[PDB]
């Protein structure tokens, strides 16, 4: 929640806002870790394909 806090908010509201931000950050970190592992796996298999291109299926006849 992108809501600016005022001076009048007390407990059970500020605490709920803070834990909502914490849960959002936790899900965001899980998503970023998934993106990093997916990119690493795809780069590894594309490097394997480039190496297979280097070894064979490269020439004229």
């Amino acid at each position: 929640s992108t809501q600016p806090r005022s001076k009048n908010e007390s407990k059970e509201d500020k605490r709920a806002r803070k834990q909502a931000i914490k849960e959002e950050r936790k899900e965001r970190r899980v998503e970023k870790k998934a993106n990093k592992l997916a990119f690493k796996l795809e780069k590894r298999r594309q490097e394997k394909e480039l190496l297979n291109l280097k070894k064979n299926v490269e020439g004229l006849k």
Binding site: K55, N56, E58, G59
Partner: protein, 141 residues
């Protein structure tokens, strides 16, 4: 500084062998991984069956086409590429021909203008490329 005691022999030999493992030649010789990744399997020459003829482009500052031959080895089944050395010697190689193949000389390293080729053809159909090139022998088929 080095430990220069009288009872420090086992420390010195343990350190020497652990730092021996950090050499490139020693690790390539002794780890047993480059021996298993070597297509020849630590042999001087191998014998294969010709699959295809390839025109490999030369590395950039020299512009030419090298006539190589893609073969499949008999004893392990690996596919390798061997450069046919002289001019007009490619016409002696045919598909599904038995070839004796040796390396270039840099022991597993790509040599000179040809990228990704470790090997060169020595004999074609149980006669040498040199005798065919010089017209000393005829090849059967």
């Amino acid at each position: 500084g080095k430990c220069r005691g009288l009872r420090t022999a086992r420390k010195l030999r343990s350190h020497r062998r652990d730092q021996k493992w950090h050499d490139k030649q020693y690790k390539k010789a002794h780890l047993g991984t480059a021996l298993k990744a070597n297509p020849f399997g630590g042999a001087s020459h191998a014998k294969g069956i010709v699959l295809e003829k390839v025109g490999v482009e030369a590395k950039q500052p020299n512009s030419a086409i090298r006539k190589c031959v893609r073969v499949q080895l008999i004893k392990n089944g690996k596919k390798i590429t061997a450069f046919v050395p002289n001019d007009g010697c490619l016409n002696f190689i045919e598909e599904n021909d038995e070839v004796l193949v040796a390396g270039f000389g840099r022991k597993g390293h790509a040599v000179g203008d040809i990228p990704g080729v470790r090997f060169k053809v020595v004999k074609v159909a149980n006669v040498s490329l040199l005798a065919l090139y010089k017209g000393k022998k005829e090849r059967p088929r």
